[PDB]
Amino acid sequence: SQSNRELVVDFLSYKLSQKGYSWSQFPMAAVKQALREAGDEFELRYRRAASDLTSQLHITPGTAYQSFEQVVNELFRDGVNWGRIVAFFSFGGALCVESVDKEMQVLVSRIASWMATYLNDHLEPWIQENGGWDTFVDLYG
Fold this sequence. Notes:
By secondary structure, the protein is mainly alpha-helical. It has seven helices and no strands. It has a single domain (1-141), classed as Blc2-like (Apoptosis Regulator Bcl-x, Orthogonal Bundle), CATH 1.10.437.
């Protein structure tokens, strides 16, 4: 999915805009907006993270996909559900914001790619089995 890709960029742009940073490096609309409020709702409710997750990752430009993958896997240690996909997306957002705080802005489009790879590979199967983003919208939107 180029579609999945678009979700990722839209989510991460939203978070970057929201938190006072640039987003320059860059039904659908209903999915997008539902995911936008879902992360906000998950971040307010938690403040839990990222945790030793971003902690666990300490991203640099020498970081490769596989390390990202290894960390994000801890989220899905009990398999997938809608909440953990919310957290996966909020996770990506936090990692973009840290990247920019460390003056590592190049990473932002990289992190976006990883997220889209990880999504399309490990998450799309479960998502498709449980009703697609339609259901995500029935439950969140």
